[PDB]
Every structure is written in C-alpha cells, then in structure tokens.
Paper text:
[name] [name] up to three distinct [name] enzymes: NanA, NanB, [name] [name]. [name] is an unusual [name] in [name] its primary reaction product is 2-deoxy-2,3-didehydro-N-acetylneuraminic acid (Neu5Ac2en, also known as DANA), a nonspecific hydrolytic [name] [name]. [name] adopts [name] same overall topology as seen in NanA [name] NanB, with a CBM (residues 85–271), followed by a catalytic domain (residues 272–740). [name] catalytic domain adopts [name] canonical glycoside hydrolase family 33 [name], six-bladed β-propeller fold shared by viral, bacterial, [name] mammalian sialidases.
[name] CBM presents a CBM family 40 (CBM40) β-sandwich fold with six-antiparallel strands forming a convex surface [name] five strands forming a concave, carbohydrate-binding side. Asp boxes, motifs typical of bacterial sialidases, are present in four of [name] β-propeller blades. Protruding from [name] catalytic domain is an I domain comprised mainly of β-strands (residues 403–498). [name] absent N-terminal residues include a signal sequence (residues 1–27) [name] was deleted to aid [name] studies [name] a short region of unknown function (residues 28–84) of which electron density was only observed for residues 83 [name] 84. [name] binding site of [name] CBM is on [name] same side as [name] active site of [name] catalytic domain [name] [name] protein face on which they reside displays an overall positive charge. [name] [name] active site is a narrow constricted cleft, similar to NanB [name] contrary to NanA. A primary component of this constriction is [name] hydrophobic stack of Trp-716 [name] Tyr-632. These residues partially block [name] active site entrance providing [name] for α2–3-linked substrates as opposed to α2–6.
Author numbering: 84 to 471, 473 to 740
Amino acid sequence: TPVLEKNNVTLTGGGENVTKELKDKFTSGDFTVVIKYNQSSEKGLQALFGISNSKPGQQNSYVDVFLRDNGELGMEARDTSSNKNNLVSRPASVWGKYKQEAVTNTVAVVADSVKKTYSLYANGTKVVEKKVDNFLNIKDIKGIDYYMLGGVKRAGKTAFGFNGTLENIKFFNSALDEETVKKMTTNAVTGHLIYTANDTTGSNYFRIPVLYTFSNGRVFSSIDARYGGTHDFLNKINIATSYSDDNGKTWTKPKLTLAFDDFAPVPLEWPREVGGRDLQISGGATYIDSVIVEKKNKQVLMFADVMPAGVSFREATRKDSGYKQIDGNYYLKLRKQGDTDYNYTIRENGTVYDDRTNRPTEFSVDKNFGIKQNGNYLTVEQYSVSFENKKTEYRNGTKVHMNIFYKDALFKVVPTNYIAYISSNDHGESWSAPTLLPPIMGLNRNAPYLGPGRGIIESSTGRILIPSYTGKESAFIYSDDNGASWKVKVVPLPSSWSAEAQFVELSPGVIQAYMRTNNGKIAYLTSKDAGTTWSAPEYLKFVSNPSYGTQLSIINYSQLIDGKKAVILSTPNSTNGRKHGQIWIGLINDDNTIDWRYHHDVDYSNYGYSYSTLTELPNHEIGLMFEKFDSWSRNELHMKNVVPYITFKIEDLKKN
C-alpha cells in the first residue's frame, strides 16, 4: 500500500511540491519509491523526486533518485551536518528515445535500514545493490522539511529539475522485497531482451550479438554467453542461440550451441567495484566471437574462435598453428603430460599417434574433442567458482570428459587460438560436431580472429566469404567448393587495426569489406574479382570514433530504396566512447560508389552503443540487436540485461 501515489505529472524543470502529503508519513525512515516516467529532454542531471532540508546551509541534506543524459540511474542520500554522502548508481540502466518517441521506463529505489543497503531497479532488473557503512534513511538526515517531485529543493531553490512526465509515482514507507519491485518495474522495455541474465543459458552476462535471416523466413540469433562477467579474456564463454519464426515477435528459449563443460553453465555474481572488476575466470576453455552464414543449398554454417583453458589471447604464441604436416596432410598436435615437446598427432578417425614411432596409440579424440583410452572416456573434475571479494576456482566432484582444450588434460593442444565451425541442415535447430579450421595462415602462424556478424555468398562465383583479422592484416577466409575446403586471402593493412569486418556485394563480382581501424575511422576495401584482390583502403567521411574503434554491422537490403539498391550500416559514432549509435542507409550508384543518404540516431548521443548486428526481417523491416552500453569502459563491465533487440521500418530509418 502506497503512502502517496501521483500520476501524469508533466514537468519542465520546475518541480512539484508534495510536502503536505508526505511529511510525517515515513515513520521508520525506510522507503521504496517506484517511478514510471518518460523524459521530454535528456540533458543534465535530473531527479525524479527529492526529499530534502530546504533551509539555507542544508544543501547537502537530501535523498534523490536521478537520471543522467547517458542512461545512468542513480541515487544519493546525504547529510550536511554529519558530512555523510552516499551515491549508488549503474550505467546504462534506462532508455531515452526510440523511433522519435520518448521511452517509458520504470525505475525504483529501496532503502533498507536493517541491512544498510540501497537497491536500484530499472525495467525489471535490479541494476545495483550496495551495502554502505554510512547508511542514511529519511529520519537520519537532520531537518527534512521538503518533499518534491521532479527535483530537490536546496537552499530554497529547485535543483536537478526533471523534464518529462511522471506517468505514475508511488511512495512506500518500508523497504519492499526484491521480487516485488522487480515485478513492479517490468514493462515493455523488459520485453526487448532475447537473452536475459540467468535464463536457460545459466549465464548472467552476454556480449557480441549476431542476427541472421534464413531463406525460409526464420530469424536466427547467436551471442556470447559470458559467465565470468563481460571480459573478452580470461573468461568462460559459450555460444548461445535463439530463433524466431514470426518475424522477431517471439523467440525460442536459448540453447547452448558451442560450449565446453570444464566449468558448468551457472550464474556468477561478478564484482563491479574497482577492487573486484578485474578478476577473471582463469582456468576455462572458451568459444568466442561467432559468425553465421547460410549456404545456397540452405545448410547453415556457424564459426567461432576457440581458446584453450588458461590461454590468453595476449600471451598465446603467434608462431605455432597447433598443426604438423605429415605426408601432405595437416594434423592437430598434442603434448602429453610430462613431455616438453609435442610428440603426438590426431590422425584418421581421431586416433592419436606417437609421431616418434609413427604408430597409433591406445588413445583417441572424439568429434567433440574428448579423450578416450581403449574406447573408454578419460575424465576430469569440473570446476566451480566461489566468492568470499576473493575468488576461488575449485574442483566440484562432477566428472566430465577429459578434453584436449582443458587445463587438466593428459594430452593438450598448442596454447594458441583456433577457429571451429559447425553446420546445420534444419535451419539452426540442430548442429554437427565442430570442425577445427586447418592451418590456412601457414604452419607457423596462429589462426586469425573472426570478425563477428555474418559471412556472405558472393553471387557471381558462389564463393563463401568469412571475415577475420590478425592484428596487422585482414584475413578473408573463403571456400570455392561450397564449404568443403577453406582458403584465405591475407591483406596487409596500413596499421595494427583490430580489423573486425563485414562484407557487402555492390554488383556481381564486386564486394566491399567495411572494418574497424586503430585511427578513428571506418575503412572499406573494394574487390572487383569476388575477393581475390583488394584495393587500398578508403574511409567513411561521416563516422568519427575513438582510435581504438568498435565492431560494426553492414548488410545488403533486398528492396529498392528511392529506386536504388541499398546497404544498411550500424555503428557507434562518437569520439567520446562507444556511444551515439547510428543506422545509415547507403544507396548504390551505377558506378559502385555509395550515396550515404540517410541516418538515424538509435537513442540520444550519450547513451552507450558498442557491438551491433543488423538483419532484414522477412517483412522487409530491419532487426537490430546491440550492446546498449560502452563495452570499452572499465566502469561498464559485468552489467546484466544490456543487449536489446529492436526494429525499424525503412521509413523510421529515413528520420534524423
């Protein structure tokens, strides 16, 4: 039961006094406030409400909940005389606008005196809970005399004035429990998540969404389910998938499609504070950065990077592919426990050979990288993770198959990165066992790193193209035999670009690779022979990003726009961070230049926008999934429920 409920309060910075209605209602001093609002302007710091001592000198005696122009939700509780100042917040908590309309959000704050915590909720997620030593409730702050909607009265003046409509606001004079407030804050925004914290995947975190529309009208998604927070590395990451047969309206419960079981797919509460956020899961085999393509025969391919347990992308050797060539064939090498050298290879039928004697052993490696001895699986104990802000990785008593990618294996692969792929003949419902890519970069180089998103089938040749990169070169992985065998075109770049790329076809035989650079710009290279040879890079003139850059998404679109063949591009566009997401429409001219005629700002310019993926829906609308946060910032690590799915008509995308 609310002590006060108000509704449809429209404000333009000036606030509304509710002192009469609330003074003396908070007898314990605890509170819960639930606010459903939309903003008419996002600029500045804006308080949804404010409870204060308004007198001269008591400016630092107040409680509020606030929004920032970047989507951060926070609260303060401050007392002037005792000089105590609490601030609790989480980045990337709310939405601003969506297709020209202010987004309705629902947030809440819970101040619990017994356990000395402030909790904040936004759109069904408890975005933060913090225990504080200097806890303050309404009665702890001396001389509270003013209760206000849409600001805080400080020294007789409205501060932090809110611009928007408080659609509904409820004040409660007790700390309401977690599940009740989650439910109260659930709304239409909550529904835009395909993957949610601790869903079927067992993961609390996701990054690197990929969308793809199959030829039968199924809309497919894949994502990194990152268990040990959002770290690229070290981590325990699986690839999860989910699909829609109704144009993206409803989605299957996620499946784990590429996963190792040296660690279980269980939810971990990863620390976000400065002293814990650098912590990593260190002992766990990983799939990361997925790429999808549909072949002409309707078979689907998914590629991902593979990292053995404990192997850092930074530290890992770049001068060993992990393969040995024997009588013209390439076989994966292994080192047995107790040996310094790699004396063994995986040859026909997974049989492990001792290369010194050239004889098969009693050991074999199955199609899922599991080790057998005389037909029986070897096992190891699985690891769990425990926190007590020290983290422990410990053996949990469950036996799993010993695997060549695991820390505790009898036979191990070379500690480097690999690429694996799997195929599906039923539009993504079931998948083959993984195949590791052969040493296409050479025996004495590591595999490339995939550029997440999609691959393409170039139409004139039927060549399958998969984007990847080395750190110094582009590596365009391809097959001219419908995916039976793979080759690579390696293209030196102007600098050390982390060249995450995507392809478009402009006209038959003519393709472009758009990619991330280390110079602030998006580069594109052009091939007029279906990827065999590439021009020097050119740069988009209208995107300006930080030097580190971000992944992009670009797709071909099937319908004419203004009479012309089109492409559609998604990227952040800001020098200040991974922010200011835009979708751009490019119209192909007869000379194969592009007229980049339209752009659309996805939300307000300070709102986070990192890795993204576009797809054309069967109805010819556009689906977008994206990281609605800044995935470079160390302040925005390890956040839950921050990778939404939204959609746009071309008519929406023409606006901005």
